[PDB]
Amino acid sequence: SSQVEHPAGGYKKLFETVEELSSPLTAHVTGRIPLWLTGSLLRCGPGLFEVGSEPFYHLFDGQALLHKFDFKEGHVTYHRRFIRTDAYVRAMTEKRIVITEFGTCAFPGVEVTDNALVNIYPVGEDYYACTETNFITKVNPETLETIKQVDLCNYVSVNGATAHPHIENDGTVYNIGNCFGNFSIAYNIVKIPPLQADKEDPISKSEIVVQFPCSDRFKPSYVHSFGLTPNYIVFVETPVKINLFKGANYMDCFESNETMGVWLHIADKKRKKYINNKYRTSPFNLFHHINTYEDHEFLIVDLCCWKGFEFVYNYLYLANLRENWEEVKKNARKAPQPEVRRYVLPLNIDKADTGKNLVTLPNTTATAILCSDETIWLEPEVLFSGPRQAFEFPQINYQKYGGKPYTYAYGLGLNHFVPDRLCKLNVKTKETWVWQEPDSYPSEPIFVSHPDALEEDDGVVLSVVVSPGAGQKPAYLLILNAKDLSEVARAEVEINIPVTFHGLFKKS
Amino acid sequence: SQVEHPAGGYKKLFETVEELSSPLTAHVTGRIPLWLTGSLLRCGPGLFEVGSEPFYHLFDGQALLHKFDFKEGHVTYHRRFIRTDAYVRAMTEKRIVITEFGTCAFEVTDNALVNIYPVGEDYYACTETNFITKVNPETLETIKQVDLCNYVSVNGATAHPHIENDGTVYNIGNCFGSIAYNIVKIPPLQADKEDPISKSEIVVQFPCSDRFKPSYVHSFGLTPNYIVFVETPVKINLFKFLGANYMDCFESNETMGVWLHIADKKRKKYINNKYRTSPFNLFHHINTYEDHEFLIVDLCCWKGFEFVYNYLYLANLRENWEEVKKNARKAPQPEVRRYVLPLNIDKADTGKNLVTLPNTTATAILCSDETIWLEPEVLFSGPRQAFEFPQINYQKYGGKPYTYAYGLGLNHFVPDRLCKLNVKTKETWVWQEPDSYPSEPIFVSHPDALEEDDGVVLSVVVSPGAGQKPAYLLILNAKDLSEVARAEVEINIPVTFHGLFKKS
Ligand SMILES: CCC(CC)C(=O)Oc1cccc([C@H](O)CCN)c1
């Protein structure tokens, strides 16, 4: 066995419109749903890929659909509702595309999209669906009703914020976004506090804690996520640049800087100060940090990388993802290559070590060379590398190991950009585990710990799987044992489920 | 699972020995394959001081030629110092006369301690200078000194010439074009029976990144159609060259990274493709081959621009284990890397990955300035654990698609294991015994083999632990590196670098 093939083309169902439900369906359980598993798997993704005869072009254009699998006493329900954003509501009103999406211009001031199709996260006692703009949407996690639109610009100085905020155990939320900060561009870290006794909305207490500089005065890098430890914030500035100068959509504004490579930045979290260490390495795209942690006076930075400066999103138009298998493979031939990489950033830079490798840790092959111009050139330790086989959408045991020394990551395996397997990676030994079934296309795995867990990987991962082959249920919730990715149960439904990006498990 | 060497036996690798007058019989354990007939010839330092005057660097000790003979399941061992100018004059004057790599004498060295290779019907021991030494492969007698400058325009040549099946020899060396690098070609022995070295010629020249500073070059790549040269940031400062030794002339260029160069072998033409990547040291190419208009370039790399030789002074290699580990903490990290070089550069693909091969994660980005930026596929990576001194089934798979490489495993620069690497699957095999320090493994095919790894590997092992024979020849099955036999001797054997198996 080598290359897994998908000639039947079932992955097309990931990109096909569905209708919302009026109320939850019961799901047919096979195997055994863990009896300790009590709560809601909430996930976001596109659900409407055209408004009548007007199509959406890009993967990130379809209208936000909020999904929920509920678990109780070994039984499972499924429910979904479109998020009532301005983009969706106005589209349903005017029966056309009203708001410009990432890769779809709307034809008839700057009406920025609030299509919150990417992720959902808690703030205080509330939950917010999001994309990557200034608009986030408050949602009801039980009914999936849309509550309110929130403009972050009303509270803090950012043009947007990522769909990947970090959330500390006390409920503090950290996020990053491009801003104006000289009349130069910069990146601001936003901090949203936990809900206090006064019970006021935490978003009204938002503040900028630290600012990162920009490599280009007028062009911020695209930032999808960032790293957080107890003491440090890590930001990776990639050569994918947003041209603020330039019937255009967002996608038309991106360009690749050929000469800058990647700049890595650290800030002291507690002292709220940028550290002027000029970390540099070769060009790559970065969407998802896996995890970050401190080891002696070094930051361990585990990344899902794409080797090259070409923007990976160029390969994610719906027309291309809907092609037949042979064409899908051909399309990916010249794309950046995915690779899981560990970078190690020294915090203590001694001039006496100019010209030498500063990474004195015993358990890594990552290096960091102090140059005479004071730049620190980084080389990674490669943890996982497969030909056009990405370990993507990484997840860990976040609550206990986020920002801390860890061993295990879980991922969605992309086969020429098509999700077709689930993966587990031991980041110390590089051992992997895989779950895969033919004609089955899974989603990001989310880890849920066993309540009496002793080890890091004592629990399950949850994934939403599309399996449209005739003589099969069209979709199901997959439960794997986190130890070995062995199948524990499925909760089958008799309707299609389109692609979802990110989500969370809300314990009850 | 760090392997430790507190007993410090590796120090015997760097201890002077005496030559033999004639071969010793070796005590065989296990079974020597009966098809194994010939001589394992290997070179290394054997004399690490001249009286009270010490040699300082690993590459300074006086060349010692070793030989294990195999016949009908029996093994002999023999060694003789090579009678170079450096050795002869040292024995005459009872001091260090010629400056060695890292030892100034208080006249370029011909201390041929590195390798031995065939030219026509002859065998030459070599270092990396213009002087190579003809030797008798049966008696180990020194025959004569040859100056390559008498024949071709090069200042020196590597100890890693490529040798085609017909006997054609290719090598590279720095020269004067500006500085440049010349490929030397020595033809096979013809019917006229004249010395092939007298028919030497420069076939192609590579340009230099710096007008006055050539990169150090230890080896290069060769396929049926192409020559691959890797120009590293380790530079030789000819100004500071012309009480200094060779080591004092090296410096690291911080900004250039690595430049890769290809030349058309048959059309004898340099190809102006500006391949670029991040900085590393390179000593040993593993293998090179052509795959559908791409060159696959497998390298043993060291991550960084600091010269790895800085860590190879004898004083440092002789320290106790805890000190040896501490010394290597800030050294470049070893890594086996596969680079893929596109031969077809289309402007229409500017900004994109040109490596469309299905079986690699290596990339090559065409930039607007026309440089091609390379990223490798990593084949092997261990913390301060080098897969080094690589060997393949060279006669049948050299320059061609291949699967298997064999290597010496370096533990903080100390050789302590033998390794096999599947370069397609990245599966490895290991042979290792405590207090045993092996040498470069050399692959010998079963003469009727159709498979790539159907044979044995030979390694010379030092094992000085009390209640043991001090050294032995190890024979492993090439399939799984399982032990087949040993040929034990009752004398020490110092470190050897490279060599060959001469079939008889
Ligand atoms: C040009 C400004 C950028 C960044 C501030 C922006 O807003 O980019 C998006 C605009 C709309 C949607 C999206 C999707 O969420 C991307 C997929 N995760 C990104």
Ligand SMILES: CCC(CC)C(=O)Oc1cccc([C@H](O)CCN)c1
């Ligand atoms: C500075 C000029 C260079 C030529 C590139 C040179 O001559 O370097 C050496 C001089 C003497 C000995 C050696 C050893 O063989 C190195 C270890 N294999 C190298």
Ligand SMILES: CCCCCCCCCCCCCCCC(=O)O
């Ligand atoms: C589950 C998605 C399958 C379709 C193809 C996915 C390709 C993803 C490429 C790398 C990750 C880029 C970020 C997308 C997810 C997000 O919006 O957070």
Ligand SMILES: CCCCCCCCCCCCCCCC(=O)O
């Ligand atoms: C077997 C030698 C052990 C001692 C330390 C060896 C470290 C070698 C570093 C990489 C290879 C450098 C070139 C040395 C061999 C040669 O001269 O051809």
Ligand SMILES: [Fe+2]
């Ligand atoms: Fe994401």
Ligand SMILES: [Fe+2]
């Ligand atoms: Fe060598």
